[PDB]
Design a protein around this nucleic acid. Sequence first.
RNA 1: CCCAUAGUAGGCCUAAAAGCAGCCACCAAUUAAGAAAGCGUUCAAGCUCAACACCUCCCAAACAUAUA
RNA 2: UAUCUACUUUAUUCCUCCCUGUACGAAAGGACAAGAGAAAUAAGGCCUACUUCACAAAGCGCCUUCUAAAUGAUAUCAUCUCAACUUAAUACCCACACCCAAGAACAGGGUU
Lengths: 157, 156, 146
Amino acid sequence: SKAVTRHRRVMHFQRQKLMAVTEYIPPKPAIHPSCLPGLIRLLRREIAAVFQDNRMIAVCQNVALSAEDKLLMRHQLRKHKILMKVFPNQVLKPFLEDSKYQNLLPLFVGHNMLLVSEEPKVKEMVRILRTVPFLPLLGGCIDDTILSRQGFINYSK
Amino acid sequence: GYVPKTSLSSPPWPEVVLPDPVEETRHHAEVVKKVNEMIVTGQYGRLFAVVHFASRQWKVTSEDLILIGNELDLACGERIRLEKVLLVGADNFTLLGKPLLGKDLVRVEATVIEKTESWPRIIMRFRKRKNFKKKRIVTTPQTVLRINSIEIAPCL
Amino acid sequence: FREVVETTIIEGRITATPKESPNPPNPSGQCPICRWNLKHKYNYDDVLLLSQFIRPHGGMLPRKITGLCQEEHRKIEECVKMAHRAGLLPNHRPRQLNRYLTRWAPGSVKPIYKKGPRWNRVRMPVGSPLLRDNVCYSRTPWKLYH
RNA sequence: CCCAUAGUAGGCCUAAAAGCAGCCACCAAUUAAGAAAGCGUUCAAGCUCAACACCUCCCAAACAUAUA
RNA sequence: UAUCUACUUUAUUCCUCCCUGUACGAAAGGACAAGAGAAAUAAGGCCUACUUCACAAAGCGCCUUCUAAAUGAUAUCAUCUCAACUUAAUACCCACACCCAAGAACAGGGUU
Ligand SMILES: [Zn+2]
């Protein structure tokens, strides 16, 4: 058999013993190492500007709609100067403690959309929400005073 | 550095605590004194020695025979003190040297009885197809020793 | 732990939460194995260690709840498999040949009808190679193939 | 795991070929979904992806635990 | 012209028919299984007939032939699970001499 073959040629036995003795040994540490120890500021400036803007705020669980249905809700609230805002609560949890909202820290989680306002059409917004047997009103906060949904009935009325 | 008791927490063998060398060297002194009293007052019966005569170790009592595979160049009848005794045992004690015992402790005597040759002992070589066939016949010299006595002495 | 009590009424009652022993001997370890100096010092024999990671119907607990190492989660997962089959967890039922050290599921292994020549012999797996790096107090290591 | 509107059925060629028969640009709206990466239809309409909102008959027997 | 080794009594299938022209499909179509039949082969016997024949042996003749579910963790959904749990050989044989359905010899059966 030639020195170059098509199959891996069988080594001489001392060749093979050399190859086994001179194998690579990796280092072993005494302790395993794994067992040892722009858009963000766009949201901060934008939503922080929305904090100082609104006198009244409300919020819902606006995930339970269709696209054209959210277009209808977008137009029926476009009829007012109220604004709706889908934004991550991931950044909104440091937003509240920045804006000194300690009663609003247990408010903003899961799917939610802001209803920031200065003029309450929120009674008529409830009039739009009464025809759909879901999507409840989550509590707001006008001028560092919290609004329960009962408070939305009282203030909205 | 605590490990809770699992299968592989501890090694499987039980730990031995070897005794401290103060009470242990004192204890050895007690034992050697006992055995030395047995050698003084003659408590033992018959002894056996392991003796490194020639090139090999013979286990040996009194009144027996050893066949040695060389001519010792002594006359028949000559007594011999076998040095190089390396174990001496009685019924209730033994004494074993590192590696040999003291000459002042043990004395093993042996007489030469006979100086024979061996039976004729063949040495044949043969390789096939090569016409290779040698034959030799060898008899080695031999002497027989009769171990007379294993005397022991109180030197501990 | 919490339970789901039902009768039609369905409520959830947090009942009898345990806690880990106050002094890990290796604090600032990561896994609860790593915290207690048990990185290679458990097997399928010792069921006091295995039982703490098992659902009461015999299954494993996920890695996020136990907070195990990835390595030690596969090791405990394997040891728990190897200990259900040796009958060491009899009370982790939902409601006969003696085995131990069984790597594969007993009803899934074809018998070796042609064990090979001496240089290509089909061997029988014994134990798991996840447990290679355990402390062997013998000189010969664990033979994983019989 | 989700989750998908709108300028628009992008222009030209093409019976029409619309993100998906081909060329070229590949901008833009909300907070954000590519003038489109795979099914799919003559063409469409419908399905996923990125991104948004939660994140001849086998062949030693055997054996994983005691200190090299 | 056989010296040695080895050896010399270890039930399938086709067609018909029925179930049924139902199940299944929606119409065309069209089951299984199990059953009855008739055949054929193989295996094991047997001679009442038939046939070669005739105190018998035969065949062309007859007889017999018995991995898949649920549940469910790793990975709280799911998941058939090299996850755990649960569930889906009898028969046969067995104590001189003369004749023999026994037999090469030996052996065996019978001899009231
Ligand atoms: Zn660890």
